Design an enzyme around this catalytic site. Structure first.
Site, PDB file in Angstrom:
ATOM      1  N   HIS A   1       0.869  -1.324  -0.050  1.00  0.00           N
ATOM      2  CA  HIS A   1       0.012   0.079  -0.035  1.00  0.00           C
ATOM      3  C   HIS A   1       0.857   1.208   0.229  1.00  0.00           C
ATOM      4  O   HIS A   1       0.334   2.300  -0.373  1.00  0.00           O
ATOM      5  CB  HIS A   1      -0.860   0.204   1.116  1.00  0.00           C
TER       6      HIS A   1
ATOM      7  N   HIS B   1       5.423   7.098   6.970  1.00  0.00           N
ATOM      8  CA  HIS B   1       5.390   6.605   5.709  1.00  0.00           C
ATOM      9  C   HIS B   1       4.587   7.669   4.737  1.00  0.00           C
ATOM     10  O   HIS B   1       4.232   8.835   5.443  1.00  0.00           O
ATOM     11  CB  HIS B   1       3.961   5.414   5.548  1.00  0.00           C
TER      12      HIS B   1
ATOM     13  N   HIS C   1       1.977   9.021   1.187  1.00  0.00           N
ATOM     14  CA  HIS C   1       0.978   8.992   0.124  1.00  0.00           C
ATOM     15  C   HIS C   1       1.294   9.866  -1.006  1.00  0.00           C
ATOM     16  O   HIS C   1       1.860  10.998  -0.710  1.00  0.00           O
ATOM     17  CB  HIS C   1      -0.386   9.058   0.741  1.00  0.00           C
TER      18      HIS C   1
ATOM     19  N   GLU D   1      -3.450  13.428   1.028  1.00  0.00           N
ATOM     20  CA  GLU D   1      -4.532  13.039   1.666  1.00  0.00           C
ATOM     21  C   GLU D   1      -5.559  14.277   2.126  1.00  0.00           C
ATOM     22  O   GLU D   1      -6.512  14.636   1.634  1.00  0.00           O
ATOM     23  CB  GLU D   1      -4.588  12.056   2.628  1.00  0.00           C
TER      24      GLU D   1
ATOM     25  N   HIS E   1       3.185  10.987   6.771  1.00  0.00           N
ATOM     26  CA  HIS E   1       2.596  10.541   7.816  1.00  0.00           C
ATOM     27  C   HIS E   1       3.484  10.281   8.987  1.00  0.00           C
ATOM     28  O   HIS E   1       3.991   9.077   8.835  1.00  0.00           O
ATOM     29  CB  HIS E   1       1.407   9.799   7.866  1.00  0.00           C
TER      30      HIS E   1
ATOM     31  N   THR F   1      -6.254   6.619   7.999  1.00  0.00           N
ATOM     32  CA  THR F   1      -6.760   6.726   6.653  1.00  0.00           C
ATOM     33  C   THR F   1      -6.771   5.505   5.698  1.00  0.00           C
ATOM     34  O   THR F   1      -6.937   5.760   4.555  1.00  0.00           O
ATOM     35  CB  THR F   1      -6.005   7.948   5.730  1.00  0.00           C
ATOM     36  N   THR F   2      -6.183   4.562   6.080  1.00  0.00           N
ATOM     37  CA  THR F   2      -6.303   3.118   5.707  1.00  0.00           C
ATOM     38  C   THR F   2      -7.072   2.174   6.644  1.00  0.00           C
ATOM     39  O   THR F   2      -7.211   2.391   7.674  1.00  0.00           O
ATOM     40  CB  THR F   2      -4.861   2.469   5.624  1.00  0.00           C
TER      41      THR F   2
HETATM   42 ZN    ZN Z   1      -0.990   7.739   5.978  1.00  0.00          ZN
END
Ligand code: ZN
EC number: 4.2.1.1
Length: 258
Positions: free
Chosen positions: A62, A92, A94, A104, A117, A196-197
């Site tokens: 992911h 991590h 995005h 995000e 994040h 958010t996941t």
């Molecule tokens: Zn995140």
């Protein structure tokens, strides 16, 4: 057929396996800068990463995650909107397929090229797994990335990505200093939200920095060379691994600055 970011398993599908996706404090959200209210009661944010100890970097299918040894009181986030102390466990990113999307959170509907994040758990709950079951279990520090000058402190991360191209690959990643990923200013917006996941748990105090960091086009291009798939599977580039803005519902975004 597990969750992902594709046409048939992406954010619009998540609610089927994770009904909280349509809940009352979901993340990310659009930050309306004119509606966010300055809160003079907020204390200054305290980011103490001098003793941070990274362990490993992992491609989990992911994103990639840089994990830290959180068995001692070291890399801690406190102050700001927080009560108590939260310990860094991982960070991590995005990012997008193009520089015009990837973040995000959005700011007045603006999408950044990516978003970092840094995930911390409330030490009062003893460990991460127990923390995520609590409304004040996590504090996530969100930092926007825009494309411009290189971020020298990110380069060590970018250079290891070749070794974890596909889902399930991991590599030793010691002595990485996350202070190198922070912008100058710690001005922030804060609101209560979620992971958010999946599982999308409503356990996060979000702290989103106003000042983005700049990374180079070459640096973000290397993020985009990663793969969602595992080794020996059809290649699908790891891009657009962001959840879009969710309804703010009954929440207020507070600003640490005026
Ligand atoms: Zn995140």
């Amino acid at each position: 057929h597990h969750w992902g970011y594709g046409k048939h398993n992406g954010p619009e599908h998540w609610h089927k396996d994770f009904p909280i996706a349509k809940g009352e404090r979901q993340s990310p959200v659009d930050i309306d800068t004119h509606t966010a209210k300055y809160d003079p009661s907020l204390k200054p944010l305290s980011v103490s990463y001098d003793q941070a100890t990274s362990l490993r970097i992992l491609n989990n299918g992911h994103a990639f995650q840089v994990e830290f040894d959180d068995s001692q009181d070291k890399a801690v986030l406190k102050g700001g909107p927080l009560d108590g102390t939260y310990r860094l466990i991982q960070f991590h990113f995005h990012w997008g397929s193009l520089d015009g999307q990837g973040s995000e959170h959005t700011v007045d509907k603006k999408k950044y090229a990516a978003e970092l994040h840094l995930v911390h758990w409330n030490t009062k709950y003893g460990d991460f797994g127990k923390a995520v079951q609590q409304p004040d279990g996590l504090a996530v520090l969100g930092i926007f990335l825009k494309v411009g000058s290189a971020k020298p402190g990110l380069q060590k991360v970018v250079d290891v990505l070749d070794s974890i191209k596909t889902k399930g690959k991991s590599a030793d990643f010691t002595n990485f200093d996350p202070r190198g990923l922070l912008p100058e200013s710690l001005d922030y917006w804060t609101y209560p939200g979620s992971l958010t996941t999946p599982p999308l748990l409503e356990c996060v105090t979000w702290i989103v920095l106003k000042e983005p960091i700049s990374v180079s086009s070459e640096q973000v291009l290397k993020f985009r060379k990663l793969n969602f798939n595992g080794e020996g599977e059809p290649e699908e580039l790891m891009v657009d691994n962001w959840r879009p803005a969710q309804p703010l519902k009954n929440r207020q975004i507070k600003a640490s600055f005026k």
